[PDB]
Design a protein around this ligand. Structure first.
Ligand SMILES: NC(=O)c1ccc[n+]([C@@H]2O[C@H](COP(=O)([O-])OP(=O)(O)OC[C@H]3O[C@@H](n4cnc5c(N)ncnc54)[C@H](OP(=O)(O)O)[C@@H]3O)[C@@H](O)[C@H]2O)c1
Ligand SMILES: NC(=O)c1ccc[n+]([C@@H]2O[C@H](COP(=O)([O-])OP(=O)(O)OC[C@H]3O[C@@H](n4cnc5c(N)ncnc54)[C@H](OP(=O)(O)O)[C@@H]3O)[C@@H](O)[C@H]2O)c1
Ligand SMILES: NC(=O)c1ccc[n+]([C@@H]2O[C@H](COP(=O)([O-])OP(=O)(O)OC[C@H]3O[C@@H](n4cnc5c(N)ncnc54)[C@H](OP(=O)(O)O)[C@@H]3O)[C@@H](O)[C@H]2O)c1
Ligand SMILES: NC(=O)c1ccc[n+]([C@@H]2O[C@H](COP(=O)([O-])OP(=O)(O)OC[C@H]3O[C@@H](n4cnc5c(N)ncnc54)[C@H](OP(=O)(O)O)[C@@H]3O)[C@@H](O)[C@H]2O)c1
Ligand SMILES: N[C@@H](CCO)C(=O)O
Ligand SMILES: N[C@@H](CCO)C(=O)O
Ligand SMILES: N[C@@H](CCO)C(=O)O
Ligand SMILES: N[C@@H](CCO)C(=O)O
Ligand code: NA
Ligand code: NA
Ligand code: NA
Ligand code: NA
Lengths: 332, 331, 332, 331
């Protein structure tokens, strides 16, 4: 039996769900010969009422170098980056839920991802299998990928379809714990774009630049636009697409008019739809935001590490698209 | 005596300070023949402890069309936009502290600003008189503008000069109520860029796009860099700059090495510095964040409205810069 | 028009209700030629979510000497005492809700009460008129006084009468904001005893010692004891009594078996029942705890001060009881 | 493997630390053939953020009679009493951190303590082994006992030595989770008196009344008094004392001038010092408050129970003091 020493960065929606999940599953962990021991939980304000014991809360400096794992759910880019890098350089793995971090700080983080030190299933579709799904898709060559990757905006669209207003659905999504602290990241497509970037790097090109993703959000959509789509036999969704144009991979996020019986239009939660050679058409759906959903992904990654598997390695090589593709039609 | 009926969107740092200021100052409004009456206060969580009566909290959106004024300080862009547009469409003014809303949703909001329906003193440097300062500066032709517009970042750099860490200073800024919900908006320069856009629109180009502001933040600054600057008789500040380059207005936010005796370097609080023709060089400074500071700006706008004055108008046309300029050196 | 500068000590149940009430009634205040201006609100922890704006919160040192009024609702004895005394010595009035303070620190505070500097209607039966009621009773001589002065214990008894348990009624009383932070003060009769002391000092003896009050609480009472009383045509209540025995005033707190149609048994809230010469029998009832109830008393006292009336002066002289008395029967 | 079914009363500083300790350490219980299973956790406000699953929170009292153990850390006296007595009546042990409950409700609880059904290590000096220390001290006849039992007051006086104010030190004690909900219980000596009563009951008189403890607190101490004491080679501490006077056991809590090199003056943490016959002079010290510290004591008691050992028994008879004693000088 031995201790698994965890340093947790962040004690919010995701971090507090993860802390409690780890201790709630300590019986599972003992079956792996480990007992979990948090070293501390990095937070901003120790006095906020919080679902972690106050005594475990930390302010910087919070030394990470005795940890067996750093788990990060702080949000942002530069603040987590400067904390994780000393632990990665010491060969301590990072399990993260932070797409922005990975999308925007890849020059610093790619070399550690290439060594198997970064686990980030929870950074795309929370604990819904998205990264593990694509890793198994490597058996084939991608033809086209289309996903609904932002939980907050999916929620809002679904609620507007039912005749509810944008502003009340946003408020709900925020209370549900789905939204980024800057909700424009959600609604402008940027969080989806971060996630798309990560999917491109795992599968098609380990250097795919976040700057190349074209993104636009849901700010022109209303219950009326969505109700008219429904009348045309369509559903409008924000869709993140990776597809071939000109022998290069293109990545875009935008509202799309989907056929209403398409898998993406009928998804139960966030969804990833792919066509690949020779596999064919495959699909995965589930919750894509929320504290418990996300904690599940982080804990899956923790079990993955205890198994002796490396983290999520980028694509070993960049390859052009086999097939010219396109997205669905945009919204006028 | 008649009611002045107010719908308040947001009951947080700024909205609660405002609510409580209006109540404390309510007797002042009797000079205009009114008593303030709040129709409702939009909030997310009506169970949080709050200095606003439970009976007035609305955890869902409510009808605004009986209001005399809508006051907004809820943060974000598309949600406040969609909530205020029907009021604006009905000729009900908006008083707002939300720079992001105005910077990012200007295609929608510009026409109402042009009609005098939008008051936003509190959206730049809180209740420090920045927008009224610039309104009087329109007597002259702008040569160049440089401000220190972000409260949080200024506070951080000043504390880091005094030996505190970046982290400790940020935390104290947050406890003081200065920061955006996502403090990267502060420290990456985005909030300063939103405010810079509004300044450009008021002065030189009423269609100035937020997207044309270049912004960087303070991520590369260490207490070393700040102390080397001091060794050079400089101070490093995040500065928002509006200046002519090639016959066109540029807008940029970045860390700048300032001479230590420049008004911007020395100012007590956030600061806005101009040169203009024929006035010369003028400067205003004061608190640029904080609930009470912001509530003062919102209430100043409410008194402006009660006086019969319109809101803050965009520049009546675009025009090119009279002179070529530049910012200070970067870091 | 002029400012009324208030220093508030305490921002809890009572203090936060008072702050908000003052600003909510600022239109009333202007009719008195004043505008209210808080100088600060003394609290322990500035980060607790709290129904006062964070910027107005203070930690010691909090200078009070520019105030026109100090309002205190901190609780305890020594902590408020050391803060109020410099303001009283400078001739600044105190409006307080703190019975314990006055009961236990009367050697220090009596001389200021005798000068008209202490207003404390909210210290007995919250904003229910109890002190003002007794002041008007001075037209007569007291024969006997009996009150139900503790809100928490009244609530618990009422709930147990309905078959609910002690522990769930306590929990409710606490959520309702009724209880002292040490709930044994309530349930052991001590808070009632503090209040009884104050009533004795206003009416019969300005030096009446808190140590002379005999107190016992409700800890032997159960739904069964109360249900049996009801069957006997009785109600059991904790009662605070001032009555003559031997030519001296005696003060006691204890459970009593009351006739079920007695005013004290049928009270709507906390209650004060007196017989006096030549007035006769008089009674006052209302809410005796709760933040808004209490804020009402503190604000009544603030209006009283703005009127030019002094605070609650102790009895000008000690007089023996005219009449030998007794309480109701105790509970076996 | 079988469930060890636990009903937890209280989910605060101590109850949540306990809950989370049991879960972290759960694998240890497999040595006894059990896995811990909580039947419910009694709390007042089930909406507060809490490190205990929402599904297990009970905002009202729930049936305890299927439990194997009741664990109590809810505070107060009559409410926990009424909640635990039916479990005790059914032969279900109680593990408690609540000194007040035991000190004040002993007429009710004594008979169950005598049957080995009450474990309360955590009620005195948290998980520092005070009660097991005294259990081994029963090999000897008590001469005198002196402790520093209140964590909050010790912390305050130590910080005031270092120049912090009384107020600032109290506030930090509260943020550290040390203080009672009413901190006057700490600083007036009442909490120390409750604990002193329990010590007397364990050692010398199983019926020792809480009401016979004399208690005063630290209200008269200033940083002056503490610095004059140091000038005299003394330290001032709140001390709980059990000693013979006139053939009877006295119990007192008060500020005492200690020689600065006495174990009590120097101790790292809260401390319990005895002299006994024929052992001599022995001493134990360690953390006396705090969630984790307390959870360690509760969990130590849970392991004690799983081992087959009874709870903490009162002294099997009263007896008079062997020797006359006294405390240190007062202040
Ligand atoms: N919510 C979801 O559904 C979800 C799902 C998947 C991925 N994510 C990603 O997971 C990450 C966390 O999201 P969230 O919803 O948990 O955020 P959150 O609720 O805002 O939590 C962030 C936490 O990190 C702390 N923190 C943030 N910046 C810090 C700094 N510079 N120094 C010290 N402490 C810091 C915060 O302190 P305080 O509590 O004291 O402020 C808080 O405990 C983000 O990267 C987000 O994009 C979220
Ligand atoms: N802080 C400053 O110094 C300052 C100064 C000038 C301008 N500003 C701007 O003023 C605005 C407010 O800032 P602040 O500091 O007051 O933020 P804050 O404390 O976070 O308050 C935001 C308020 O709006 C509510 N809210 C947020 N999103 C909502 C939604 N979707 N639906 C309904 N209610 C919602 C929140 O509800 P809950 O309370 O229920 O969460 C809260 O009452 C922002 O636009 C900020 O940029 C701030
Ligand atoms: N509740 C009622 O129904 C009621 C009715 C009438 C009279 N009373 C009396 O009114 C007084 C207040 O009662 P309450 O229910 O308001 O108490 P509460 O909710 O516990 O509030 C006490 C307040 O004073 C603060 N405080 C306490 N001691 C302090 C210290 N030493 N230094 C600085 N701040 C201090 C607290 O800070 P934090 O919030 O940061 O801890 C809190 O803001 C008591 O004397 C009580 O007997 C109560
Ligand atoms: N703090 C220490 O260092 C320490 C050490 C040893 C012993 N103790 C003793 O341990 C006990 C608990 O202390 P603590 O610091 O954990 O207090 P705490 O943080 O205030 O927690 C008390 C808990 O009990 C709940 N509660 C209180 N009264 C209740 C009622 N009438 N009905 C239902 N639930 C109720 C509270 O509910 P909410 O959370 O919903 O309010 C909270 O979960 C006390 O007896 C204290 O003397 C404390
Ligand atoms: N804000 C993100 C959280 C989950 O990654 C979303 O709505 O998808
Ligand atoms: N976050 C903003 C608040 C004031 O607009 C700032 O620091 O300047
Ligand atoms: N705890 C007190 C509050 C009101 O004085 C009671 O229950 O009466
Ligand atoms: N309030 C108690 C907690 C520990 O029993 C103390 O300070 O000692
Ligand atoms: Na995932
Ligand atoms: Na301004
Ligand atoms: Na009263
Ligand atoms: Na112990």
């Amino acid at each position: 039996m031995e201790a698994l020493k965890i340093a947790l960065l962040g004690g919010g929606t995701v971090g507090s769900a993860f802390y409690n999940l780890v201790l709630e599953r300590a019986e599972e962990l003992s079956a792996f010969g480990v007992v979990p021991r948090f070293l501390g939980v990095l937070v901003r304000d120790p006095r906020k009422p919080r679902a972690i014991p106050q005594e475990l809360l930390r302010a910087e400096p919070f030394d990470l170098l005795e940890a067996d794992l750093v788990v990060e759910a702080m949000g942002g880019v530069e603040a987590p980056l400067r904390l994780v890098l000393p632990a990665l350089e010491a060969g301590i793995p990072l399990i993260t839920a932070n797409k922005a971090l990975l999308a925007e700080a890849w020059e610093s983080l790619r070399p550690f991802a290439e060594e198997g030190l970064i686990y980030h299933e929870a950074s795309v579709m929370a604990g819904t299998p998205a990264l593990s799904f694509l890793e198994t898709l490597r058996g084939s060559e991608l033809l086209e990928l289309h996903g609904i990757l932002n939980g907050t905006t999916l929620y809002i669209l679904q609620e507007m379809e039912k005749g509810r207003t944008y502003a009340e659905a946003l408020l709900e999504a925020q209370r549900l714990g789905y939204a980024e602290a800057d909700p424009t990241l959600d609604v402008e497509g940027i969080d989806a774009a971060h996630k798309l970037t990560l999917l491109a790097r795992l599968l098609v090109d380990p250097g795919f630049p976040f700057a190349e993703v074209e993104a636009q959000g849901i700010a022109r959509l209303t219950p009326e636009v969505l109700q008219k789509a429904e009348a045309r036999g369509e559903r409008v969704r924000l869709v993140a697409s990776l597809f071939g144009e000109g022998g290069r991979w293109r990545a875009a996020v935008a509202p799309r008019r989907l056929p209403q019986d398409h898998p993406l239009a009928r998804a139960r939660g966030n969804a990833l739809w792919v066509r690949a050679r020779p596999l064919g058409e495959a699909f995965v759906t589930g919750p894509g935001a929320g504290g418990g959903a996300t904690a599940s992904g982080l804990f899956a990654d923790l079990l993955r590490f205890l198994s002796g598997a490396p983290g999520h390695l980028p694509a070993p090589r960049a390859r052009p698209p086999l097939e010219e593709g396109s997205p669905w039609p945009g919204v006028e």
